[PDB]
Amino acid sequence: GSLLRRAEMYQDYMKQVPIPTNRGSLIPFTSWVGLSISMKQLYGQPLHYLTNVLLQRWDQSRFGTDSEEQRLDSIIHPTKAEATIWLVEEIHRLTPSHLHMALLWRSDPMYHSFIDPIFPE
């Protein structure tokens, strides 16, 4: 039963945050985490634990490349990138159980580092 109270409160909160229907202009970016910070600044909403973990994994995945350094937004267009993040965020708001979240957090000693603070409102 470890972490069940906080997982339930967390998922109950995130499932109720609406995905913005009105979008801004394209956001230049050089990392997925960077793009997510821009989105949090501009739209003033948190992103889900599962989104923050996924974006960090996408950034980590680029390391070790044989290619020369290249801006991420020269590979994935910012409009598509932001759309991707809102799509995965909607999945993570609407589908996972709080039991599943508690199970992940039991195995992730740093889980709190992927949970956003409360935003104004």
Side-chain angles (χ1 to χ4, degrees), residues 21 24-25 55 61-62 65 68 79 81 105 109 113-114:
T21 47
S25 298
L55 297 183
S61 81
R62 300 182 65 207
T65 181
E68 289 296 293
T79 294
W105 297 349
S113 74
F114 294 97

PDB file of all heavy atoms in Angstrom, residues 21 24-25 55 61-62 65 68 79 81 105 109 113-114:
ATOM      1  N   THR A  21      -6.831  24.171 -25.625  1.00  0.00           N
ATOM      2  CA  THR A  21      -7.328  24.085 -26.988  1.00  0.00           C
ATOM      3  C   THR A  21      -6.728  25.176 -27.849  1.00  0.00           C
ATOM      4  O   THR A  21      -6.498  24.964 -29.029  1.00  0.00           O
ATOM      5  CB  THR A  21      -8.895  24.157 -27.033  1.00  0.00           C
ATOM      6  OG1 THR A  21      -9.344  25.236 -26.211  1.00  0.00           O
ATOM      7  CG2 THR A  21      -9.507  22.938 -26.365  1.00  0.00           C
ATOM      8  N   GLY A  24      -0.258  28.585 -28.870  1.00  0.00           N
ATOM      9  CA  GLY A  24       0.586  29.688 -29.317  1.00  0.00           C
ATOM     10  C   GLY A  24       1.374  29.365 -30.558  1.00  0.00           C
ATOM     11  O   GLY A  24       1.118  28.373 -31.269  1.00  0.00           O
ATOM     12  N   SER A  25       2.361  30.220 -30.850  1.00  0.00           N
ATOM     13  CA  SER A  25       3.221  30.048 -31.994  1.00  0.00           C
ATOM     14  C   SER A  25       4.279  29.001 -31.713  1.00  0.00           C
ATOM     15  O   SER A  25       4.487  28.584 -30.540  1.00  0.00           O
ATOM     16  CB  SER A  25       3.932  31.389 -32.297  1.00  0.00           C
ATOM     17  OG  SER A  25       2.936  32.375 -32.627  1.00  0.00           O
ATOM     18  N   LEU A  55      10.157  12.674 -21.660  1.00  0.00           N
ATOM     19  CA  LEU A  55      10.939  13.699 -22.330  1.00  0.00           C
ATOM     20  C   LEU A  55      12.422  13.583 -21.945  1.00  0.00           C
ATOM     21  O   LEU A  55      13.295  13.741 -22.829  1.00  0.00           O
ATOM     22  CB  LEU A  55      10.400  15.082 -21.915  1.00  0.00           C
ATOM     23  CG  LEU A  55       8.974  15.316 -22.341  1.00  0.00           C
ATOM     24  CD1 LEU A  55       8.549  16.732 -21.968  1.00  0.00           C
ATOM     25  CD2 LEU A  55       8.757  15.085 -23.808  1.00  0.00           C
ATOM     26  N   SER A  61      18.407   9.741 -25.046  1.00  0.00           N
ATOM     27  CA  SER A  61      18.604   8.821 -26.174  1.00  0.00           C
ATOM     28  C   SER A  61      19.491   9.356 -27.283  1.00  0.00           C
ATOM     29  O   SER A  61      20.002   8.596 -28.122  1.00  0.00           O
ATOM     30  CB  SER A  61      17.214   8.390 -26.735  1.00  0.00           C
ATOM     31  OG  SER A  61      16.689   9.394 -27.591  1.00  0.00           O
ATOM     32  N   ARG A  62      19.701  10.675 -27.310  1.00  0.00           N
ATOM     33  CA  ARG A  62      20.472  11.268 -28.394  1.00  0.00           C
ATOM     34  C   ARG A  62      21.967  11.148 -28.115  1.00  0.00           C
ATOM     35  O   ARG A  62      22.748  11.305 -29.052  1.00  0.00           O
ATOM     36  CB  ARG A  62      20.155  12.758 -28.515  1.00  0.00           C
ATOM     37  CG  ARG A  62      18.638  13.013 -28.800  1.00  0.00           C
ATOM     38  CD  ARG A  62      18.352  14.509 -28.956  1.00  0.00           C
ATOM     39  NE  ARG A  62      19.034  15.029 -30.131  1.00  0.00           N
ATOM     40  CZ  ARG A  62      19.422  16.301 -30.254  1.00  0.00           C
ATOM     41  NH1 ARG A  62      19.184  17.180 -29.275  1.00  0.00           N
ATOM     42  NH2 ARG A  62      20.034  16.682 -31.375  1.00  0.00           N
ATOM     43  N   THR A  65      25.773   9.803 -30.175  1.00  0.00           N
ATOM     44  CA  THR A  65      25.642   9.832 -31.613  1.00  0.00           C
ATOM     45  C   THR A  65      26.986  10.117 -32.298  1.00  0.00           C
ATOM     46  O   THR A  65      27.833  10.860 -31.768  1.00  0.00           O
ATOM     47  CB  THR A  65      24.590  10.862 -32.038  1.00  0.00           C
ATOM     48  OG1 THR A  65      24.476  10.855 -33.469  1.00  0.00           O
ATOM     49  CG2 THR A  65      25.040  12.293 -31.710  1.00  0.00           C
ATOM     50  N   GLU A  68      27.604  15.190 -35.826  1.00  0.00           N
ATOM     51  CA  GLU A  68      27.948  16.469 -35.200  1.00  0.00           C
ATOM     52  C   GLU A  68      26.717  17.010 -34.475  1.00  0.00           C
ATOM     53  O   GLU A  68      25.593  16.661 -34.832  1.00  0.00           O
ATOM     54  CB  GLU A  68      28.416  17.484 -36.251  1.00  0.00           C
ATOM     55  CG  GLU A  68      29.787  17.194 -36.857  1.00  0.00           C
ATOM     56  CD  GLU A  68      30.914  17.255 -35.837  1.00  0.00           C
ATOM     57  OE1 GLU A  68      31.192  18.360 -35.315  1.00  0.00           O
ATOM     58  OE2 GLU A  68      31.522  16.195 -35.557  1.00  0.00           O
ATOM     59  N   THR A  79       6.317  22.725 -34.090  1.00  0.00           N
ATOM     60  CA  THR A  79       4.870  22.546 -34.077  1.00  0.00           C
ATOM     61  C   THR A  79       4.538  21.083 -33.828  1.00  0.00           C
ATOM     62  O   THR A  79       3.649  20.771 -33.022  1.00  0.00           O
ATOM     63  CB  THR A  79       4.307  23.019 -35.421  1.00  0.00           C
ATOM     64  OG1 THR A  79       4.526  24.455 -35.501  1.00  0.00           O
ATOM     65  CG2 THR A  79       2.802  22.871 -35.420  1.00  0.00           C
ATOM     66  N   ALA A  81       6.641  18.871 -32.452  1.00  0.00           N
ATOM     67  CA  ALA A  81       7.157  18.523 -31.144  1.00  0.00           C
ATOM     68  C   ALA A  81       6.175  18.899 -30.049  1.00  0.00           C
ATOM     69  O   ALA A  81       5.893  18.092 -29.137  1.00  0.00           O
ATOM     70  CB  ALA A  81       8.536  19.261 -30.915  1.00  0.00           C
ATOM     71  N   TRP A 105       6.383   4.645  -8.659  1.00  0.00           N
ATOM     72  CA  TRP A 105       7.104   5.462  -7.705  1.00  0.00           C
ATOM     73  C   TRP A 105       7.856   4.623  -6.635  1.00  0.00           C
ATOM     74  O   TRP A 105       8.924   5.026  -6.186  1.00  0.00           O
ATOM     75  CB  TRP A 105       6.164   6.488  -7.071  1.00  0.00           C
ATOM     76  CG  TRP A 105       5.604   7.465  -8.062  1.00  0.00           C
ATOM     77  CD1 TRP A 105       5.995   7.672  -9.382  1.00  0.00           C
ATOM     78  CD2 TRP A 105       4.539   8.382  -7.807  1.00  0.00           C
ATOM     79  NE1 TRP A 105       5.253   8.685  -9.939  1.00  0.00           N
ATOM     80  CE2 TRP A 105       4.353   9.156  -9.003  1.00  0.00           C
ATOM     81  CE3 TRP A 105       3.754   8.672  -6.678  1.00  0.00           C
ATOM     82  CZ2 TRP A 105       3.384  10.153  -9.107  1.00  0.00           C
ATOM     83  CZ3 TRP A 105       2.789   9.679  -6.756  1.00  0.00           C
ATOM     84  CH2 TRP A 105       2.613  10.427  -7.976  1.00  0.00           C
ATOM     85  N   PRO A 109      13.440   5.971  -6.883  1.00  0.00           N
ATOM     86  CA  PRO A 109      13.839   6.784  -5.717  1.00  0.00           C
ATOM     87  C   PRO A 109      13.787   8.309  -5.961  1.00  0.00           C
ATOM     88  O   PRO A 109      13.654   9.100  -5.020  1.00  0.00           O
ATOM     89  CB  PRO A 109      15.294   6.347  -5.483  1.00  0.00           C
ATOM     90  CG  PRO A 109      15.328   4.972  -6.030  1.00  0.00           C
ATOM     91  CD  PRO A 109      14.513   5.052  -7.319  1.00  0.00           C
ATOM     92  N   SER A 113      11.251  14.205  -8.308  1.00  0.00           N
ATOM     93  CA  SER A 113      11.949  15.133  -9.169  1.00  0.00           C
ATOM     94  C   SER A 113      11.321  15.258 -10.550  1.00  0.00           C
ATOM     95  O   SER A 113      11.647  16.170 -11.303  1.00  0.00           O
ATOM     96  CB  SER A 113      13.439  14.792  -9.262  1.00  0.00           C
ATOM     97  OG  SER A 113      13.645  13.663 -10.060  1.00  0.00           O
ATOM     98  N   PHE A 114      10.365  14.369 -10.834  1.00  0.00           N
ATOM     99  CA  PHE A 114       9.641  14.436 -12.100  1.00  0.00           C
ATOM    100  C   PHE A 114       8.184  14.909 -11.946  1.00  0.00           C
ATOM    101  O   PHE A 114       7.357  14.815 -12.887  1.00  0.00           O
ATOM    102  CB  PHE A 114       9.670  13.058 -12.812  1.00  0.00           C
ATOM    103  CG  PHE A 114      11.021  12.655 -13.237  1.00  0.00           C
ATOM    104  CD1 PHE A 114      11.757  11.798 -12.446  1.00  0.00           C
ATOM    105  CD2 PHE A 114      11.570  13.157 -14.418  1.00  0.00           C
ATOM    106  CE1 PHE A 114      13.062  11.410 -12.858  1.00  0.00           C
ATOM    107  CE2 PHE A 114      12.826  12.788 -14.833  1.00  0.00           C
ATOM    108  CZ  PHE A 114      13.583  11.923 -14.038  1.00  0.00           C
TER     109      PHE A 114
END
